[PDB]
Design a protein around this ligand. Sequence first.
Ligand SMILES: O=C(O)/C=C/c1ccc(O)cc1
Ligand SMILES: O=C(O)/C=C/c1ccc(O)cc1
Lengths: 514, 514, 513
Amino acid sequence: PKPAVELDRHIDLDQAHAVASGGARIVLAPPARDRCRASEARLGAVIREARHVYGLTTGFGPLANRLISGENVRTLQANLVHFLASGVGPVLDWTTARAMVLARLVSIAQGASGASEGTIARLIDLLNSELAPAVPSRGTVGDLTPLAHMVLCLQGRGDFLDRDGTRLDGAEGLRRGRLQPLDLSHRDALALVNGTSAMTGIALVNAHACRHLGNWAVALTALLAECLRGRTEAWAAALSDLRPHPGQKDAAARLRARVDGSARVVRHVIAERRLDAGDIGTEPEAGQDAYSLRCAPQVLGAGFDTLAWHDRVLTIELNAVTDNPVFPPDGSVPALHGGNFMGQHVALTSDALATAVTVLAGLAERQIARLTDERLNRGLPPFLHRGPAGLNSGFMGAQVTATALLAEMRATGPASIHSISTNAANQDVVSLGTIAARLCREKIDRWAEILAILALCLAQAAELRCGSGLDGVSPAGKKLVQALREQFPPLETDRPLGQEIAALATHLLQQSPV
Amino acid sequence: PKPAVELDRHIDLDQAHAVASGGARIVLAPPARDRCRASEARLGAVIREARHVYGLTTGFGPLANRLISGENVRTLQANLVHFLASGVGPVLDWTTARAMVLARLVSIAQGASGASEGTIARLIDLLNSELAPAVPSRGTVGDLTPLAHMVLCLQGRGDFLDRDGTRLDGAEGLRRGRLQPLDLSHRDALALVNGTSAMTGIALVNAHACRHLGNWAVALTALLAECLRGRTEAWAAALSDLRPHPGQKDAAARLRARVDGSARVVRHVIAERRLDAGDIGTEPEAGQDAYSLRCAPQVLGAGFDTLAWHDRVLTIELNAVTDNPVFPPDGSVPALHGGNFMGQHVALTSDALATAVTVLAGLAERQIARLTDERLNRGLPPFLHRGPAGLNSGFMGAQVTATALLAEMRATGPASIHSISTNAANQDVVSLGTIAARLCREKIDRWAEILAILALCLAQAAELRCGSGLDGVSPAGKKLVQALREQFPPLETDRPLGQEIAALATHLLQQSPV
Amino acid sequence: KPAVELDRHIDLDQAHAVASGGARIVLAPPARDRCRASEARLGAVIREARHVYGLTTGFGPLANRLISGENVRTLQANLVHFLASGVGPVLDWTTARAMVLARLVSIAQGASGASEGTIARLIDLLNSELAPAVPSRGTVGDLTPLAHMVLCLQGRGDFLDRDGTRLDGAEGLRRGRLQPLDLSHRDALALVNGTSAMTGIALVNAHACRHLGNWAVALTALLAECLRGRTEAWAAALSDLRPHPGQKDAAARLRARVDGSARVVRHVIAERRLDAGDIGTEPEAGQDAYSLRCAPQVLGAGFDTLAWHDRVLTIELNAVTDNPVFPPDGSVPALHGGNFMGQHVALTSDALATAVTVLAGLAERQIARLTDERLNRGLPPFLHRGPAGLNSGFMGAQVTATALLAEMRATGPASIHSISTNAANQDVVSLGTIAARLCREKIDRWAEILAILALCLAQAAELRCGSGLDGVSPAGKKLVQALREQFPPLETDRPLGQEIAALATHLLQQSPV
Ligand SMILES: O=C(O)/C=C/c1ccc(O)cc1
Ligand SMILES: O=C(O)/C=C/c1ccc(O)cc1
């Protein structure tokens, strides 16, 4: 059948991605259902009592000094969704748009948003269907705009996307997915248009993708060592202990496991060798590898620690209530007004992860540059070509493409530093977290393409070095190459590699080598 | 009666775009045809005499040290197109891809490429058709990769694009366009896979778009003055003469022309007024406007001067021969080997223009921020809303979206500074001109979206200030607003503006307010 | 003077105390014992002629050239020589000393083989009032600056006194009562190794950020007292709903700063029940602009970034980033790897730099609002005193704060610029030192922006509450009174440049307490 995630208070990143990707169905646990019913009742009381609350009795933003009569709240909230729907640009992909819906749902599930049962049910239905709302990616300063567009979609006044990205009009979407048109009669519109749902959704997808790419980065570094007689002593646990960064210790341990059983790497500790007068001279190779191999634990490790921080922060954000206003469950006050919608946390972690991804992509790019260079690849053919040299150039084009992809990644920096006072100076500081998460996503995609090129190069190098039978190659190394060869043929003669690179990249983002 | 551009030696940017956009057919002038026939013969002689020439008797890149025998040249060049086809990412748009084809053709028309009549005919046929080759946008470090993909398409081994961007397979493209499959039997493949065609094509399209956006920037700045009682003395010709930057002089003159006949702007020179004792005190407003109006000539002027430099360099590049190797028409030597393919010129001008575009986009964004701010717009409704305030928020959403678009533009910097040694260190320095051109393009697209928002705001602001009859508004101002109103209704009540912003943006990129 | 006893672990505060000269340093007996054990191990490795980088080999790609024992002294002397190609302004006194300390902490773990004399030279330097004069540029991340350090310690390079005044090598040894470094034990690699430079810069960055962060909170609080800020946005209940540690902390500290204030608005707006007659346009909105309302969220994100930066730095500072390294357990004679790759400090420094730029932006917008007559709710334009027009008050300083911020924004992360070098042997580099230095510059700019905000607030508090600061919180009063001891009110326009600079210097070293 299909796994089910029961949402109560906390959901981890893997469960979140399982629901967003449609791998798991979602159910609201009874305790959460009750907390929400209780919050729904508080919203009703707040409205009946005519309490001064943003979005219920006031205009929006700087126009909040304009109070609104109870009789016009339906109109007020309907116009809110209208004026905020100014988004432009390509729509968020299927999984990401759904991840945004999930983020809003989790926040509501805490029971401080006043969302009605019907409203919550509409979100749950969307997540359990095979559809996703079609929402423009640009417009928010960090996430009312994309969420307003989502509202329109859920009402059948906006497009939906199937798993392939093909768009369906509103009516067809509600029909196909058996979704009921969203009804905001309870005046709970602010429960849907609020918080950091978009950036959080984009970021959770980024987190999942990086985990997989990180695994490939490790696996490919290990296979590279098997193709270039890499020295395993640089990956010793003893070194990790002397500089105990968790990410590094982990990267080194994972690299050691990848080459376990290999007869292609050099496992001797050079310091065990005692030299005598006859040894003093110039040896063919230095006693240690170039950094792209020797410093892999340190480079990958730093990236892993950045991702770990990103995920710790994101886990808190995903399970938080980023709504404004909010209705305290304890009933201490009718409502609280603040700025929990300021997505500075996801903005800063996304920018940091973006830098880490660019750094790791650089490592992979240099690994390709070393492996394909006849002067540095220790005996392998130039650009790993087969057939007569000259007539054939092998991966010579693909190698430059990897560099071009990396150079492009470097052209874009952090989004967070570009805050600009807007909304008549009322939003004098903005997070730009949604843009930050999206820019990181792009780099992640480029990284997957660079890794794909490295994987194809390594599959070829492994066969050139060890023969088609991959003699001496580790069990893990053999399985990886064999799996790649199931869909990607050896490069016996020059052929277009663009489509294959794109196809493999898509795979790397969703599955790890195991 | 579809216009025709006769190509001999030189072609300007407007003619180039006319052909690339399909607004004009292209024909090769008699002298050009002859220069090419003569060059074709020179290539035959070079092959006949077995001259040591790159791509004719050698491998590619660092592999050029491997000499190739005449009987294997067909295969050599066939593999060249193959190994180079490692491009990925969204394909270049219809117009840009065709601009690339045109750029290669103009280079060849100088008669130093050795292209055969058939090869030239294939390019001409493509340009005179309604199709464009479907080529991936990423892969080059600056443009063999995208050009190799072009070759495949032209042979019927790659997709094509119709004016709407809908993809056709190789066969369908040749059929629907009534094209002959490209035949490289004359060993003239390097006449197609060479130079800076892609970045040049992308840049010439950027050039055309910037001219139109620049006209809108001037037009909207002028209309803004009519909506805020702007002072025209800051735009006086006398100021331009005191600081003679061509772009500034032009910007000021164009601004004055836009408000000619306006009764909504203040034309009185403040220094003409003589003050008495009873004047000393605090006046309602200062004698000078904020910079977004007062400094428009200087800000727009600097941008225009940047575009002028960009266009001068681009014009030389488009009409030059960026091939390697080349066959001297004067017959001095069989061939010359160098690096005219190094796209550093387009790389630097594209980066400079990208900065200028971001700066000008900032001006527009600040003009929107001021116009929608009730504390700064001198009496206009907050966010130019209609209907009850608070219940309606007008362009409050669109204003923030404009800020978000600008913030995203700023996150991406120059592409040129990221050169990385590649191709086994043979290409130890690369231009990244194609990337630079593409990054500039994206910024141009964001600028158009920001200008569109400003345009919609100004149409509303004009009517709110001067009534639906636009009383006192200049003839140019009236025409622009009336033209907009033909497709974009007034905002009498809040409504989603995303789709309208996108639609208007597409228009601003291809047409100026006239 | 307090003393920090170094055994195995030292925290960031103890580290800065030693680097800043506020505390002496002593190597604990257990550390001295472990180091002596390591010194003995290096001796054996040499006697046994084990194949070890720097002891029997050339450097970098030249390590394939094996070296005979009789030439090792020359080998390591030339190492220090060819690495001394550094250029640029020297690291400041505190930072250069922090670098020396970082190398020492690594050595104290007992896996570097450093001799007692070598260790003594590092301790002597730290206990003196001097710092080695080392150029800040040259390393891709930290052999170059450390090589310069070695030359200084041998009396072949300048020293800096606390004031930054330079002394030649001979004068430095004499004045500081330092003995010339002797590397006869062939333990040069114990000094020219690891990530000491970037770590030292980063720990100084960490200390400065803690203080500026305290000011950012104190000034946000005082801003609330000058603009009738609403405290409900800083409620702990909101923190609990979105439990980021940094945010909860920021909010709590903000509430504490305004405790006792009668100038802030404490009413919870939702308590108010509206009547038909109230419907219309009120003078002010029920919530403050983001520079006040979202302060816990913005400051909080910055504080969580700093916390991550500090966690990673603490591990780095207390680790052994040496290569090669000599295992205390004796499992193998020596290990060869890349613990000198400064990617951790590179990534955290870049991340912190971004956070600093974000927080400086907040401070800058707070100034922009406070000085705007249209937004400061009744305060004079640009907080001037005397006749308006004739006086412009802080109109210049406000633009200056904007200029400082704009400059900060022009520089991005350093880590993404790795370039294959050293004949492709170092095909990937961290650039961690550059990263930490770029972060330091942003920190210096942030201090100047905060200094401007502080001077504006002192004036604004007096204009709003009178010289007696009526209704101002005890903490707010104490902060202004402290500032006023050295910075007079602005009763008439005057040059503020030097005062801004002087105050910024103070903000980096002390918090409002
Ligand atoms: O809470 C606020 O003060 C700001 C609200 C806001 C709502 C819609 C926008 O488009 C911009 C700001
Ligand atoms: O002109 C050169 O030396 C380099 C040529 C080259 C051709 C195809 C590539 O993929 C990389 C470099």
